Amino acid sequence: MNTGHDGALAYDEPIYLSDGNIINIGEFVDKFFKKYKNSIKKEDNGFGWIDIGNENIYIKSFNKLSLIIEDKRILRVWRKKYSGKLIKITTKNRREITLTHDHPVYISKTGEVLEINAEMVKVGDYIYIPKNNTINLDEVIKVETVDYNGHIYDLTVEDNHTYIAGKNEGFAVSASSGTLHHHHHH
16 A cells, blocks of 8 residues: 555546547536435545446547557546645646646656656656547646645546546546556456
8 A cells, every 4th residue: 555646636627538528527427426326335435436337438548558549438436525736737739637746647768658656747757648549748848736625536447547537638647446456356
């Protein structure tokens, strides 16, 4: 069990459906929490998740296995409350996102995809981003934060452990389920 890890996104990060709905992650989740009120499970750690694999809805995902853009369907979602400073890593293409400092994201190591914390991804690291069908690099330019005090939200995209989320068109980053890739089923 690490100190860092275990992320989430701000309420007003887009999530880019396979249909392009450009909806707030927090509204997306909360719709389910407001219909499936009965289905609001809490964790022992007092979190709050719901399965939405029953909506079957498709998100624009990507597959790490070839850095390809495909669909998937989400299986569960999460919500927590947060107040603090979130990292606002911009890139030249006016991308940006609103996430934790210990948030797993990807960078170039000179041609290799490597996996690090967002707080290390400054104006001297190349933060991996999606393109059309493909993956590209863009330069981190502006390095600052926001103050945020609302709620935060996360997923269960267990399927390839990768999703799109963020602002503009978004970032191809890690997804998970329980913890640093455990999967305890059968």
